[PDB]
């Protein structure tokens, strides 16, 4: 699930995300076009595991990524200790189970669409209003009413506490 997702949606933020957890039901509530969904889908992740993920192929044929990884590796971001991120780079190339490189291109393209929408203030805030208006489902009142009726066998507001005495 995720609940941070829900907090940003209610407070006027647009969402850049993958099609998993809360993002799915958030897309379904507000329409996927009002969200910046990108990258591998659950089934695509599975299909990449069938092919076998070779992160090297991505690093080799994506120049903006190769430059970024080389800087991290060569010590451009760590001049005094240039091998500080060796284990990060080693992981991204050989043991990356979370397919960071495989989703980089899709993520970059998706961030460009974010950049083009922010460039137009009015259409940015219009999409925001569409998000906020469709977030009502993600109230814990709704969740708790659900638990109460379908699990606990209690009805909300069947107990009415009256004003106290001092």
């Amino acid at each position: 699930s995720g609940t941070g997702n829900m907090k940003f949606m209610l407070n006027g933020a647009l969402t850049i995300g993958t099609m998993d957890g809360a993002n799915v039901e958030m897309a379904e509530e507000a329409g996927a076009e009002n969200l910046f969904i990108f990258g591998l889908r659950v089934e695509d992740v599975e299909a990449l595991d069938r092919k076998g993920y070779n992160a090297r192929e991505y690093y080799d044929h994506l120049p903006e990524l190769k430059q970024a990884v080389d800087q991290i590796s060569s010590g451009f971001f760590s001049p005094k200790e240039p091998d500080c991120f060796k284990d990060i780079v080693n992981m991204l190339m050989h043991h990356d189970r979370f397919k960071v490189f495989a989703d980089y291109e899709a993520y970059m393209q998706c961030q460009a669409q974010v950049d083009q929408l922010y460039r137009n203030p009015k259409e940015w805030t219009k999409k925001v209003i569409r998000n906020i208006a469709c977030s009502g489902k993600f109230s814990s009142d709704r969740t708790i009413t659900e638990y109460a009726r379908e699990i606990w066998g209690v009805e909300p507001s069947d107990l009415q506490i009256p004003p106290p005495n001092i």
């Binding site: 005094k80 200790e81 240039p82 500080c84």
Partner: protein, 169 residues
């Protein structure tokens, strides 16, 4: 003879006994140290090499830490003399490494405090020279050697295989 970096503390401890107990002059004690000690390395790639946090040394061995710091400074002054302005060479060659905490590279301490450094097979010894301690090799190639490992013919032939031993005899 230092079989790996496990007995690496031999360098600052010999320095300690000579200078603090035996009242020998620092420089003399150091030239004595380097000539008595030799180091054998058994590993490939520099990340397998033994490191200790300096904080652990601050508590357990405060005098050895002082000696290590003095050995390192004098060693980097020498490197600074031979290669002036080479700031990254100083960081690579230092016995103390920076990171999430300061650490003492015991292998670097062994190289600096030994007259000889050997690998255990011909190509491994070439890796020890050219990759593991590249910068140290550039400064003192003659220090670096090879001593291809061996097994004892008594236990690993005469004892375990007397039948084969007799047929050869």
């Amino acid at each position: 003879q230092l079989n790996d970096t496990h007995p690496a503390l031999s360098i600052p401890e010999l320095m300690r006994i000579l200078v603090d107990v035996e009242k020998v002059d620092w420089d003399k004690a150091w030239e004595i140290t380097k000539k008595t000690c030799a180091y054998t390395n058994h590993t490939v790639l520099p990340e397998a090499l033994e490191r200790w946090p300096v904080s652990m040394f601050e508590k357990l061995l405060p005098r050895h830490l002082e000696i290590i710091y003095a050995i390192n400074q004098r060693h980097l002054d020498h490197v600074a003399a031979l290669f002036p302005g080479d700031v990254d060479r100083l960081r690579r060659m230092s016995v103390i490494e920076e990171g999430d905490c300061k650490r003492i590279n015991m292998a670097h301490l062994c190289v600096i405090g030994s007259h000889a450094v050997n690998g255990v097979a011909r190509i491994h010894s070439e890796i020890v020279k050219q990759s593991v301690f590249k910068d140290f090799y550039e400064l003192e190639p003659e220090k670096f050697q090879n001593k291809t490992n061996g097994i004892t013919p008594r236990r690993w032939l005469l004892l375990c295989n007397p039948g084969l031993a007799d047929t050869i005899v």
